[PDB]
């Protein structure tokens, strides 16, 4: 909304024309997301400690290092607020994709907040029953996918982009809804899965958001889209602001959510970011790039399901713990080591995904 005010004031002062450039809007959105996240961090942590534990106990080691008791499990509200404010400020409110991603973010954040509030405030070990959580996630994903399909019927907005073959560009019908459901729900769950360690979830998310920002910039321009043989989507331009806001919020949260994390992020934050990445991939028609760049998340899910299948079929488990990062931790690897090694893997995956984008 702030961009419209700058455009209105352009008539009175030519200096406000800077506020309309894409690069300026993106950089300022990143900066404001980071600053708002940092500003809300210390106040949110203290307030959440009172809600979570009543007493605002000093966060210090070694308890905050190994057991991590006294650190508010509930979190990511700062991430959600920062992203929403940055997008609503430095992104055009009339762009359908901005609201298309914001609605998914807010819905997933609300479901995660219900779950975390039930688990922590009410001390219910069950928390929010998984049935209702997944039902709401599925209905939201199906609604957004149906809206996009209605807005993309007989349009390149329903095509699938093969990462290595430009000639393979099939046009999906109602199966577009199935693909959107699959990608959104799977990414949300996978990001939820990788919450077991400090800062292990906010990255890959930062690098993934940066890569999708670059792709959206490529997708948002006819010349670049034709050069890279990527589908041209007019409304995808504003998604760059959303991705930069995601990067800023992720950096601001990693300022606090890193070993020894002061505040975690439960279903809130993690599910919101997963849904945001899924809807961004759906909008950009780059689900394959989500799978490649987001290799860590899919690997986490594959490890969990492989462990479950090993338990079901054979008497010997494959991994020591269902998530691969927990499996490494139980093997003796310290938490920061696994966290930043997964960060390295994520950065390599993002670079490889951009390379493949360039191959076609």
């Amino acid at each position: 909304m702030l961009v419209w005010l700058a455009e209105h004031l352009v008539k009175y002062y030519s200096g406000f024309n800077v506020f309309s450039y894409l690069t300026f809007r993106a950089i300022v959105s990143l900066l404001t997301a980071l600053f708002i996240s940092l500003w809300m961090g210390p106040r949110m942590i203290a307030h959440l400690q009172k809600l979570s534990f009543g007493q605002v106990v000093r966060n210090d080691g070694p308890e905050s290092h190994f057991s991590k008791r006294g650190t508010p499990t509930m979190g990511g509200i700062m991430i959600l607020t920062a992203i929403v404010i940055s997008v609503l400020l430095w992104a055009y409110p009339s762009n359908p994709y901005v609201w298309c991603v914001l609605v998914v973010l807010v819905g997933y954040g609300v479901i995660g907040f219900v779950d975390d509030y039930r688990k922590v405030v009410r001390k219910d070990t069950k928390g929010l029953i998984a049935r209702w959580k997944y039902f709401w996630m599925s209905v939201i994903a199906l609604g957004v996918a149906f809206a996009l399909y209605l807005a993309g019927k007989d349009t390149p907005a329903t095509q699938l982009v093969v990462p290595f073959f430009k000639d393979v560009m099939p046009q999906l019908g109602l199966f577009y809804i199935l693909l959107a459901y699959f990608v959104i729900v799977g990414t949300g769950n996978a990001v939820n899965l990788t919450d077991g360690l400090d800062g292990l979830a906010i990255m890959p998310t930062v690098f993934v958001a940066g890569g999708f920002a670059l792709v959206a910039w490529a997708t948002g321009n006819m010349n670049f889209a034709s050069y890279l043989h990527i589908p041209y989507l007019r409304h995808a331009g504003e998604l760059v602001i959303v991705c930069t806001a995601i990067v800023g919020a992720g950096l601001g949260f990693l300022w606090f959510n890193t070993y020894p994390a002061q505040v975690f992020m439960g279903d809130v934050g993690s599910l919101a970011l997963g849904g945001a990445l899924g809807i961004i991939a759906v909008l950009l028609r780059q689900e394959f790039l989500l799978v490649i760049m987001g290799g860590v998340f899919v690997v986490e899910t594959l490890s969990v399901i492989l462990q479950v299948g090993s338990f079901k079929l054979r008497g010997q488990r494959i991994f020591r713990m269902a998530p691969i990062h927990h499996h490494y931790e139980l093997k003796g690897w310290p938490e920061p080591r696994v966290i930043v090694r997964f960060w390295i893997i994520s950065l390599m995956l993002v670079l490889i995904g951009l390379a493949t984008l360039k191959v076609r």
Binding site: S67, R69, R320, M321, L330
Partner: protein, 149 residues
């Protein structure tokens, strides 16, 4: 009178593994009490006791999956001497308590070194199928303090 949730089962029992090793017994002359419907009783045994009458005699086979789960090596962890307290010598077989986030977990020494120790948290009843000869001596309602515990 029959077993029901929130009622206390006074139990006389004999515990044997599939190999025939007698773990322990509670005779009718010295029964023992436990809640019903809370999982303190072995899960398989808790389901077996469901709805049985006072004085009923029955034999039930409880598998490893139904009692404490299967044995896992992940719960066997090395630990130095400095952790232990209040013991002159960390002789093998000694048992200590660790207050974990998931509640108390018994810790027993399986191997010992002059300055290093190896402990196992797995229950001795875990990882082996069990059979119980069981008689419900009496039934009563649980007290508020018992429910608190």
């Amino acid at each position: 009178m029959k077993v029901a949730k929130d009622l206390v089962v006074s139990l006389a029992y004999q515990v044997r593994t599939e190999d025939g090793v007698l773990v322990d017994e509670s005779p009718v002359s010295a029964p023992l009490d436990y809640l019903h419907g809370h999982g303190s009783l072995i899960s398989g045994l808790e389901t077996a006791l469901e709805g049985h009458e006072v004085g009923d005699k029955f034999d039930v086979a409880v598998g490893a999956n139904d009692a404490y789960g299967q044995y896992d090596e992940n719960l066997v962890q090395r630990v130095p001497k400095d952790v232990f307290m209040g013991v002159d010598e960390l002789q093998v077989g000694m048992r200590f308590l660790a207050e974990t986030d998931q509640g108390p977990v018994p810790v027993e020494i399986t191997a010992v070194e002059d300055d290093h120790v190896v402990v196992d948290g797995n229950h001795m009843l875990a990882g082996q199928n069990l059979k119980f000869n069981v008689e419900v001596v009496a039934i009563r309602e649980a007290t508020e303090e018992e429910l608190a515990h």
